[PDB]
Amino acid sequence: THSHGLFKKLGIPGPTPLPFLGNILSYHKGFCMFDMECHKKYGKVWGFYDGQQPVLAITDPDMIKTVLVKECYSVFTNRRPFGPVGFMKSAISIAEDEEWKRLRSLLSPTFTSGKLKEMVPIIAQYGDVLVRNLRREAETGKPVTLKDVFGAYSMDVITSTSFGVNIDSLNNPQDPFVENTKKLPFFLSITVFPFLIPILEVLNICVFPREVTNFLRKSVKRMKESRLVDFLQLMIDSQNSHKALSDLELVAQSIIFIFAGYETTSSVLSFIMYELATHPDVQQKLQEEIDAVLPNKAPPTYDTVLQMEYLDMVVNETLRLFPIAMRLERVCKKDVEINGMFIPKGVVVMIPSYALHRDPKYWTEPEKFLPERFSKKNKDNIDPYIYTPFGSGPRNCIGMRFALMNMKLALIRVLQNFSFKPCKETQIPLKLSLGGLLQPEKPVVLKVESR
């Protein structure tokens, strides 16, 4: 401090920072709107200050491939530290440098195409629970709240795919497991006072409600010492060139997988049905493709799901409009030059996916939901360093292939059985949380009718 001079020195444009806040007052309309403005105001690069912390935004595809891929192990290894985390410092999304490189290795074979193929029968069963739970609301010509029935499904898939537990969390009861995973303004006060993190690190306040973490540390070792197909097993099978996964490190990845697979898989299926509700020709065209591949509502399989090319298109286009990570970020750990531009040590480099996904300069009619931009005809003209819903490089979304599968096995089973109609209480056009998450302002609600 006052570091507020640093992009004025390097000759890089940007909104002027108020002392101690940087430009965080500019986050009132949301991260996403701030980015699209600074994109149009300033060009290919710009910078702003979260409190005292310099963030340099980059939009050049080569410069992005340099950062995410070429210069990753060397310069851009870690993301921006947030806290207090406590024992979750050992989670993979959060660890740094060699403790991350190690965790990546030990957890990479779990996410293989081969491992995921053996998960398909387990992920199939809870699509059925999803249909009956949906039917009891479809036979009752009353509108349905999507994040609930999709959250109950998203939840049903995680506990089973990561620990073996088997519930119908929607109805089936206060089963000992549904409630600690329930408790999945403070995170703004970190940005002006990041010097208060180590304060909170010595005070063992956990952003993870300390209790939940106490429930699963013991619940993991209950399962650990009972058995002695799922994530906890493929992890336990690994700890039998790197020191092996400890017992609290394993609990912490189990947690990272529960966070990951829950409100992401749930919120995306929301955004996709909304798109499918308010665009009923795409709904029918997909319903057709599903019935040609799986006649008579034939149960989907691994291979049949990678077969549906329109299903992939609807998914990708929905994610282009709703890249639920909004931004990608890496901390620059050395003085470096990349594609002819100096970036000093400590800067946080940021890629505004949601800006790029909705940039007219690459996307014709970007606000329109148009799945044909991913036709095998047109899918080739898409710069993979513009469309980046799962990141890129060695730090990208490790769960990429599984989420895509899990979400697609949800849609197939549901669009075989129901058609989805707008209700008078549907928010149209849907509006994004002015807040800090990519979710709908008003929850997505729609009419469900049985085919």
Ligand code: HEM
């Ligand atoms: C629609 C679903 C999902 C989307 C869009 C998504 C997206 C992302 C993105 C953008 C990143 C950051 C990539 C980067 O930093 O360049 C990420 C990281 C990560 N994701 Fe996903 N994710 C999804 C679901 C999941 C699921 C189901 C898991 C299951 C375990 C998962 C596990 C992770 C982990 C562990 C990381 C941190 C990677 C690391 O630090 O090495 N994600 N995800």
Ligand SMILES: CC(C)(C)OC(=O)N[C@H](CN[C@H](Cc1ccccc1)C(=O)NCc1cccnc1)Cc1ccccc1
């Ligand atoms: C803005 C601040 C700093 C306050 O929120 C974050 O801490 N960040 C987000 C979520 N963090 C979680 C871990 C987490 C989340 C909330 C509370 C406590 C612990 C993560 O790592 N979940 C794996 C996962 C997530 C989403 C897609 N796929 C996999 C978003 C994010 C983006 C990219 C990678 C990781 C996380």
